[PDB]
Design a protein around this motif. Structure first.
Motif, PDB file in Angstrom:
ATOM      1  N   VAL A  43      -4.058   3.827  -4.361  1.00 26.91           N
ATOM      2  CA  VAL A  43      -2.754   3.378  -4.833  1.00 26.91           C
ATOM      3  C   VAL A  43      -2.749   3.113  -6.332  1.00 26.91           C
ATOM      4  O   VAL A  43      -1.680   3.147  -6.953  1.00 26.91           O
ATOM      5  CB  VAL A  43      -2.286   2.128  -4.069  1.00 26.91           C
ATOM      6  CG1 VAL A  43      -2.264   2.402  -2.576  1.00 26.91           C
ATOM      7  CG2 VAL A  43      -3.170   0.939  -4.388  1.00 26.91           C
ATOM      8  N   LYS A  44      -3.906   2.853  -6.936  1.00 28.97           N
ATOM      9  CA  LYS A  44      -3.983   2.678  -8.377  1.00 28.97           C
ATOM     10  C   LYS A  44      -4.114   3.994  -9.128  1.00 28.97           C
ATOM     11  O   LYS A  44      -3.904   4.015 -10.346  1.00 28.97           O
ATOM     12  CB  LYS A  44      -5.163   1.770  -8.737  1.00 28.97           C
ATOM     13  CG  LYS A  44      -4.927   0.300  -8.444  1.00 28.97           C
ATOM     14  CD  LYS A  44      -6.099  -0.547  -8.913  1.00 28.97           C
ATOM     15  CE  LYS A  44      -5.874  -2.017  -8.607  1.00 28.97           C
ATOM     16  NZ  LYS A  44      -6.998  -2.864  -9.093  1.00 28.97           N
ATOM     17  N   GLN A  45      -4.453   5.083  -8.443  1.00 31.64           N
ATOM     18  CA  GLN A  45      -4.552   6.387  -9.085  1.00 31.64           C
ATOM     19  C   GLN A  45      -3.307   7.237  -8.877  1.00 31.64           C
ATOM     20  O   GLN A  45      -2.803   7.842  -9.827  1.00 31.64           O
ATOM     21  CB  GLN A  45      -5.783   7.142  -8.572  1.00 31.64           C
ATOM     22  CG  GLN A  45      -5.876   8.563  -9.092  1.00 31.64           C
ATOM     23  CD  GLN A  45      -7.171   9.242  -8.707  1.00 31.64           C
ATOM     24  OE1 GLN A  45      -8.040   8.637  -8.082  1.00 31.64           O
ATOM     25  NE2 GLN A  45      -7.309  10.510  -9.080  1.00 31.64           N
ATOM     26  N   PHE A  46      -2.797   7.295  -7.650  1.00 26.66           N
ATOM     27  CA  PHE A  46      -1.643   8.131  -7.353  1.00 26.66           C
ATOM     28  C   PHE A  46      -0.333   7.357  -7.341  1.00 26.66           C
ATOM     29  O   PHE A  46       0.726   7.954  -7.568  1.00 26.66           O
ATOM     30  CB  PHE A  46      -1.834   8.828  -6.006  1.00 26.66           C
ATOM     31  CG  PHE A  46      -2.941   9.836  -6.003  1.00 26.66           C
ATOM     32  CD1 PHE A  46      -2.681  11.168  -6.273  1.00 26.66           C
ATOM     33  CD2 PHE A  46      -4.243   9.452  -5.741  1.00 26.66           C
ATOM     34  CE1 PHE A  46      -3.698  12.099  -6.275  1.00 26.66           C
ATOM     35  CE2 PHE A  46      -5.262  10.379  -5.741  1.00 26.66           C
ATOM     36  CZ  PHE A  46      -4.991  11.703  -6.008  1.00 26.66           C
ATOM     37  N   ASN A  47      -0.384   6.052  -7.093  1.00 23.63           N
ATOM     38  CA  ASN A  47       0.807   5.221  -6.960  1.00 23.63           C
ATOM     39  C   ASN A  47       1.793   5.830  -5.963  1.00 23.63           C
ATOM     40  O   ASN A  47       2.911   6.204  -6.338  1.00 23.63           O
ATOM     41  CB  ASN A  47       1.471   4.997  -8.311  1.00 23.63           C
ATOM     42  CG  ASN A  47       0.554   4.317  -9.304  1.00 23.63           C
ATOM     43  OD1 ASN A  47       0.545   3.092  -9.418  1.00 23.63           O
ATOM     44  ND2 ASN A  47      -0.225   5.111 -10.029  1.00 23.63           N
ATOM     45  N   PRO A  48       1.411   5.955  -4.697  1.00 21.77           N
ATOM     46  CA  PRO A  48       2.298   6.590  -3.721  1.00 21.77           C
ATOM     47  C   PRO A  48       3.545   5.758  -3.478  1.00 21.77           C
ATOM     48  O   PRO A  48       3.528   4.528  -3.558  1.00 21.77           O
ATOM     49  CB  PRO A  48       1.433   6.672  -2.462  1.00 21.77           C
ATOM     50  CG  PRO A  48       0.507   5.515  -2.590  1.00 21.77           C
ATOM     51  CD  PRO A  48       0.217   5.375  -4.059  1.00 21.77           C
ATOM     52  N   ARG A  49       4.638   6.452  -3.172  1.00 23.56           N
ATOM     53  CA  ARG A  49       5.921   5.801  -2.935  1.00 23.56           C
ATOM     54  C   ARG A  49       5.907   5.166  -1.551  1.00 23.56           C
ATOM     55  O   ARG A  49       6.016   5.865  -0.539  1.00 23.56           O
ATOM     56  CB  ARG A  49       7.060   6.805  -3.062  1.00 23.56           C
ATOM     57  CG  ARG A  49       8.428   6.214  -2.788  1.00 23.56           C
ATOM     58  CD  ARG A  49       9.506   7.268  -2.917  1.00 23.56           C
ATOM     59  NE  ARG A  49       9.317   8.354  -1.963  1.00 23.56           N
ATOM     60  CZ  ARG A  49      10.095   9.424  -1.887  1.00 23.56           C
ATOM     61  NH1 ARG A  49      11.121   9.591  -2.704  1.00 23.56           N
ATOM     62  NH2 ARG A  49       9.836  10.350  -0.969  1.00 23.56           N
ATOM     63  N   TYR A  50       5.771   3.845  -1.504  1.00 23.91           N
ATOM     64  CA  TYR A  50       5.822   3.141  -0.232  1.00 23.91           C
ATOM     65  C   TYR A  50       7.189   3.314   0.411  1.00 23.91           C
ATOM     66  O   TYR A  50       8.223   3.262  -0.261  1.00 23.91           O
ATOM     67  CB  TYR A  50       5.519   1.658  -0.425  1.00 23.91           C
ATOM     68  CG  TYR A  50       5.908   0.805   0.760  1.00 23.91           C
ATOM     69  CD1 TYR A  50       5.121   0.769   1.901  1.00 23.91           C
ATOM     70  CD2 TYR A  50       7.062   0.034   0.738  1.00 23.91           C
ATOM     71  CE1 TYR A  50       5.470  -0.007   2.986  1.00 23.91           C
ATOM     72  CE2 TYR A  50       7.420  -0.745   1.819  1.00 23.91           C
ATOM     73  CZ  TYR A  50       6.620  -0.762   2.939  1.00 23.91           C
ATOM     74  OH  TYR A  50       6.971  -1.538   4.018  1.00 23.91           O
ATOM     75  N   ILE A  51       7.191   3.523   1.725  1.00 28.10           N
ATOM     76  CA  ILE A  51       8.414   3.749   2.476  1.00 28.10           C
ATOM     77  C   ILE A  51       8.396   2.880   3.723  1.00 28.10           C
ATOM     78  O   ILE A  51       7.342   2.453   4.200  1.00 28.10           O
ATOM     79  CB  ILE A  51       8.595   5.232   2.857  1.00 28.10           C
ATOM     80  CG1 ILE A  51       7.344   5.745   3.570  1.00 28.10           C
ATOM     81  CG2 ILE A  51       8.895   6.067   1.624  1.00 28.10           C
ATOM     82  CD1 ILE A  51       7.393   7.214   3.902  1.00 28.10           C
ATOM     83  N   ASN A  52       9.587   2.619   4.247  1.00 29.34           N
ATOM     84  CA  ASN A  52       9.763   1.835   5.457  1.00 29.34           C
ATOM     85  C   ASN A  52      10.360   2.710   6.549  1.00 29.34           C
ATOM     86  O   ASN A  52      11.118   3.644   6.274  1.00 29.34           O
ATOM     87  CB  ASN A  52      10.663   0.624   5.205  1.00 29.34           C
ATOM     88  CG  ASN A  52      10.843  -0.232   6.440  1.00 29.34           C
ATOM     89  OD1 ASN A  52       9.993  -0.243   7.330  1.00 29.34           O
ATOM     90  ND2 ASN A  52      11.954  -0.955   6.502  1.00 29.34           N
ATOM     91  N   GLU A  53      10.007   2.402   7.793  1.00 27.65           N
ATOM     92  CA  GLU A  53      10.430   3.184   8.945  1.00 27.65           C
ATOM     93  C   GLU A  53      11.372   2.350   9.800  1.00 27.65           C
ATOM     94  O   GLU A  53      11.010   1.255  10.242  1.00 27.65           O
ATOM     95  CB  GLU A  53       9.220   3.645   9.758  1.00 27.65           C
ATOM     96  CG  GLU A  53       8.470   4.819   9.143  1.00 27.65           C
ATOM     97  CD  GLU A  53       7.688   4.437   7.901  1.00 27.65           C
ATOM     98  OE1 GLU A  53       7.526   3.227   7.640  1.00 27.65           O
ATOM     99  OE2 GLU A  53       7.235   5.352   7.182  1.00 27.65           O
ATOM    100  N   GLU A  54      12.572   2.873  10.031  1.00 28.98           N
ATOM    101  CA  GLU A  54      13.567   2.206  10.863  1.00 28.98           C
ATOM    102  C   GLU A  54      13.117   2.134  12.315  1.00 28.98           C
ATOM    103  O   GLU A  54      12.995   3.156  12.990  1.00 28.98           O
ATOM    104  CB  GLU A  54      14.912   2.930  10.766  1.00 28.98           C
ATOM    105  CG  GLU A  54      15.938   2.494  11.799  1.00 28.98           C
ATOM    106  CD  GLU A  54      16.083   3.496  12.930  1.00 28.98           C
ATOM    107  OE1 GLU A  54      15.685   4.665  12.745  1.00 28.98           O
ATOM    108  OE2 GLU A  54      16.597   3.119  14.002  1.00 28.98           O
TER     109      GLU A  54
END
Length: 54
Positions: A43-54
């Motif tokens: 997460v410190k190298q790619f910084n992925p877009r965190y998402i939430n699941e309904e």
RNA sequence: AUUGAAAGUUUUUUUUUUUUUUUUUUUUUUUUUUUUUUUUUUUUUUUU
């Protein structure tokens, strides 16, 4: 982010046109490898877009 | 222009017969068409 617990994921036949269908979570049964440092590095190298699941 | 002469050495006779260059002699003896190569990768049985 957490090695000792995952989020909820959509999977299966019905997961959008329904609320009670298609809700699963993953878990490690043999956490024998260092994992939290690895997740932090990812997460410190790619910084992925965190998402939430309904 | 002789003492003084005018006579084809000619006719006739097949060098012929008998005899397979023949017999024996396997162009064979050996040599693995093998040898390295994953039918493999990508794809959510699934929505208004």
């Amino acid at each position: 982010k957490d090695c000792n617990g995952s989020k909820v994921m959509l999977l299966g036949r019905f997961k959008f046109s329904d609320k009670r269908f298609g809700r699963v979570k993953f878990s490690l049964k043999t956490p024998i490898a260092d994992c939290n440092k690895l997740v932090s590095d990812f997460v410190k190298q790619f910084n992925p877009r965190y998402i939430n699941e309904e």
